[PDB]
């Protein structure tokens, strides 16, 4: 294969002591070629802070980390090691159709460009290995000889100095072509209708709040299992559309990673040996590569089609007989396209495979012909079992949460994001790496507290235990590391700025769903669930187990005090 050689050369060539043909490859689907060479701490101060939740399995689970070559081969061949039927003809001229409108809808004020060195390093500086290499001239000029292969119509080092510059390179070229999705946002809501990127968590409950106020049938959220092992060839082809939007010079770099890296991907994996550790070399024409820059915009777009080829489904449009037709006319699909494509978009809410959608009514439920046979198989049900709506917004599941109205003591109302507590006081009480001090393991404590501070304020719980880890750890001291790779946190409370303030800032000032520009001065005036709510959700209150807590926690935040040591520190509680 001329298209995928050069890159199997170089691995080939440098890894050459240790180069062998396995016969006994367990990849079924993946092409094989060869093989070569022949985790996480728990957060003390968060753990001194939550006792109660020392008896919880959630959190016990959460705390186990097997990040491992031995944990690898269990997730690759589950549903990575197989392969997607083609989708019927009918259903391939509705999906392009559909692709083509979509993308011309997509791009109606924005136009495609190139992305650029100056972007990826503020987006690499802006968070060790990766910053050196942006900073070093040699690694830009690797990145300028792959282009000119690309530009050749040739790939060469897309998939250990070498290698982590051939990776960082390799991302570095996707972000080039296809970064401008999510630079210029393209799936922001205003542009995409259906998209939610650049919102922020703290807006999602309002734009599901939104779409339940728009007539039709239920809201449905259906999972797809292993999403990225369910793109097919064709949906690879219908995404690519995107680059007749292009100029010549960024068509041509965008055209390069499509057909060389998208639709002909080389990955390295491990795999179990009984002689030591081997990396193995696989190729493979479908599929998401799910490490690639694009995949989440692609994604969006795919799942944004699909649910409208479902919602046409639904409405009577497409029929078993149209999926199945080789000859099928575009005619009807144009027509409601063009006249009530918009209309249908904005019913949804759509984040990479990730959807809510309300449609005009219920028959959507059944409508399974077209997303089963586009690959798009739902998670855990019957394949020809309907889906399960629900009737109430705040009981949809969408980017791991749900939502709820909360009434506020002066008579206004806040739409909050939320997720069983266990979740948030799980996660909370993991470090990210070994050999953390604990200054840098309070920081994150502190990061984690003033997340729940403004995003998950209204749990009992969780407004207590933060009000326990700030009052335990330094006032002047600075929230470090990511509490949450979500790509819907913006990060709000990664800073020493008082937290009412901030809260004011989000659910008042700047909150385009709060009328009244009212401050709020207090933390007591700030609301909480209902206790029924907050107990259904998780809580502990009224267990006398957190009974005890609540009264003895002054002195768990003396102990961390006296541990950390002389510093300035403010009470919370
Ligand atoms: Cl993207
Ligand atoms: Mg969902
Ligand atoms: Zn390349
Ligand atoms: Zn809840």
Same mark, same amino acid.
């Given at each position: 294969?001329?298209?995928?050689?050069?890159?199997?050369?170089?691995?080939?060539?440098?890894?050459? *002591?240790?180069?062998?043909?396995?016969?006994?490859?367990?990849?079924?689907?993946?092409?094989?070629?060869?093989?070569?060479? /022949?985790?996480?701490?728990?957060?003390?101060?968060?753990?001194?802070?939550?006792?109660?939740?020392?008896?919880?399995?959630?959190?016990? #689970?959460?705390?186990?980390?097997?990040?491992?070559?031995?944990?690898? #081969?269990?997730?690759?061949?589950?549903?990575?090691?197989?392969?997607?039927?083609?989708?019927?003809?009918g259903?391939r001229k509705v999906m392009e159709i559909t692709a083509e409108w979509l993308?011309?809808?997509?791009?109606?004020?924005?136009?495609?460009?190139?992305?650029?060195?100056?972007?990826?390093?503020?987006?690499?500086?802006?968070?060790?290995?990766?910053?050196?290499?942006?900073?070093?001239?040699?690694?830009?000029?690797?990145?300028?000889?792959?282009? !000119?292969?690309?530009?050749?119509?040739?790939?060469?080092?897309?998939? *250990?100095?070498?290698?982590?510059?051939?990776?960082?390179?390799?991302?570095?070229?996707?972000?080039?072509?296809?970064?401008?999705?999510?630079?210029?946002?393209?799936?922001?809501?205003?542009?995409?209708?259906?998209?939610?990127?650049?919102?922020?968590?703290?807006?999602?409950?309002?734009?599901?709040?939104?779409? *339940?106020?728009?007539?039709?049938?239920?809201?449905?959220?259906?999972?797809?299992?292993?999403?990225?092992?369910?793109?097919?060839?064709?949906?690879?082809?219908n995404? !690519?559309?995107?680059?007749?939007?292009?100029?010549?010079?960024?068509?041509?770099?965008?055209?390069?990673?499509?057909?060389?890296?998208?639709?002909?991907?080389?990955?390295?994996?491990?795999?179990?040996?009984?002689?030591?550790?081997?990396?193995?070399?696989?190729?493979?024409?479908?599929?998401?590569?799910?490490? #690639?820059?694009?995949?989440?915009?692609?994604?969006?777009?795919?799942?944004?089609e699909?649910?409208l080829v479902?919602?046409m489904?639904?409405?009577?449009?497409?029929?078993?007989?149209?999926?199945?037709?080789?000859?099928l006319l575009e005619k009807k699909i144009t027509?409601w396209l !063009?006249?009530?494509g918009?209309?249908?978009?904005?019913?949804?809410?759509?984040?990479?495979?990730?959807?809510?959608?309300?449609?005009?009514?219920?028959?959507?439920?059944?409508?399974?012909?077209?997303?089963?046979?586009?690959?798009?198989?739902?998670?855990?049900?019957?394949?020809?079992?309907? *889906?399960? %709506?629900?009737?109430?917004?705040?009981?949809?599941?969408?980017?791991?949460?749900?939502?709820?109205?909360?009434?506020?003591?002066?008579?206004?109302?806040?739409? /909050?994001?939320?997720?069983?507590?266990?979740?948030?006081? %799980?996660?909370?009480?993991?470090?990210? %790496?070994?050999?953390?001090?604990?200054?840098?393991?309070?920081?994150?404590?502190?990061?984690?507290?003033?997340?729940? $501070?403004?995003?998950?304020?209204?749990?009992?719980?969780?407004?207590?235990?933060?009000?326990?880890?700030?009052?335990?750890?330094?006032?002047?001291?600075?929230?470090?590391?990511?509490?949450?790779?979500?790509?819907?946190?913006?990060?709000?409370?990664?800073?020493?700025?008082?937290?009412?303030?901030?809260?004011?800032?989000?659910?008042?000032?700047?909150?385009?769903?709060?009328?009244?520009?009212?401050? /709020?001065?207090?933390?007591?005036?700030?609301?909480?669930?209902?206790?029924?709510?907050?107990?259904?959700?998780?809580?502990?209150?009224?267990?006398? $187990?957190?009974?005890?807590?609540?009264?003895?926690?002054?002195?768990?935040?003396?102990?961390?005090?006296?541990?950390?040591?002389?510093?300035?520190?403010?009470?919370?509680?």
């Amino acid at each position: 294969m001329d298209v995928i050689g050069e890159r199997i050369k170089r691995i080939k060539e440098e890894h050459n *002591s240790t180069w062998h043909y396995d016969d006994e490859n367990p990849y079924k689907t993946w092409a094989y070629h060869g093989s070569y060479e /022949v985790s996480s701490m728990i957060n003390g101060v968060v753990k001194l802070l939550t006792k109660p939740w020392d008896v919880v399995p959630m959190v016990t #689970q959460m705390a186990m980390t097997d990040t491992t070559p031995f944990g690898q #081969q269990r997730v690759f061949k589950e549903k990575v090691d197989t392969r997607t039927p083609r989708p019927l003809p009918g259903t391939r001229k509705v999906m392009e159709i559909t692709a083509e409108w979509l993308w011309r809808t997509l791009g109606r004020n924005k136009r495609p460009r190139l992305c650029t060195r100056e972007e990826f390093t503020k987006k690499v500086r802006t968070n060790d290995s990766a910053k050196a290499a942006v900073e070093d001239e040699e690694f830009w000029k690797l990145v300028d000889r792959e282009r !000119e292969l690309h530009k050749l119509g040739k790939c060469g080092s897309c998939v *250990s100095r070498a290698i982590w510059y051939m990776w960082l390179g390799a991302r570095y070229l996707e972000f080039e072509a296809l970064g401008f999705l999510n630079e210029d946002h393209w799936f922001s809501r205003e542009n995409s209708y259906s998209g939610v990127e650049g919102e922020g968590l703290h807006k999602l409950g309002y734009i599901l709040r939104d779409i *339940s106020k728009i007539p039709g049938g239920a809201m449905y959220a259906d999972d797809t299992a292993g999403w990225d092992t369910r793109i097919t060839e064709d949906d690879l082809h219908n995404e !690519e559309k995107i680059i007749q939007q292009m100029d010549p010079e960024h068509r041509q770099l965008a055209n390069a990673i499509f057909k060389l890296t998208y639709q002909n991907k080389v990955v390295k994996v491990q795999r179990p040996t009984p002689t030591g550790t081997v990396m193995d070399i696989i190729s493979r024409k479908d599929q998401r590569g799910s490490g #690639q820059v694009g995949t989440y915009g692609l994604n969006t777009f795919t799942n944004m089609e699909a649910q409208l080829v479902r919602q046409m489904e639904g409405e009577g449009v497409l029929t078993k007989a149209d999926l199945e037709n080789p000859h099928l006319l575009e005619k009807k699909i144009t027509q409601w396209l !063009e006249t009530k494509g918009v209309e249908r978009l904005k019913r949804m809410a759509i984040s990479g495979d990730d959807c809510v959608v309300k449609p005009i009514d219920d028959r959507f439920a059944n409508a399974l012909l077209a997303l089963n046979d586009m690959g798009k198989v739902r998670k855990d049900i019957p394949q020809w079992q309907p *889906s399960k %709506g629900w009737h109430d917004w705040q009981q949809v599941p969408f980017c791991s949460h749900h939502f709820h109205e909360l009434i506020m003591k002066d008579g206004r109302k806040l739409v /909050v994001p939320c997720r069983p507590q266990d979740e948030l006081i %799980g996660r909370a009480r993991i470090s990210q %790496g070994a050999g953390w001090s604990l200054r840098e393991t309070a920081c994150l404590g502190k990061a984690y507290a003033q997340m729940w $501070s403004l995003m998950y304020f209204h749990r009992r719980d969780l407004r207590l235990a933060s009000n326990a880890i700030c009052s335990a750890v330094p006032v002047h001291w600075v929230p470090t590391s990511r509490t949450t790779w979500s790509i819907h946190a913006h990060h709000q409370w990664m800073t020493t700025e008082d937290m009412l303030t901030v809260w004011n800032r989000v659910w008042i000032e700047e909150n385009p769903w709060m009328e009244d520009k009212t401050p /709020v001065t207090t933390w007591e005036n700030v609301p909480y669930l209902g206790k029924r709510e907050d107990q259904w959700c998780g809580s502990l209150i009224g267990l006398t $187990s957190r009974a005890t807590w609540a009264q003895n926690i002054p002195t768990a935040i003396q102990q961390v005090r006296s541990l950390i040591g002389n510093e300035e520190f403010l009470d919370y509680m």
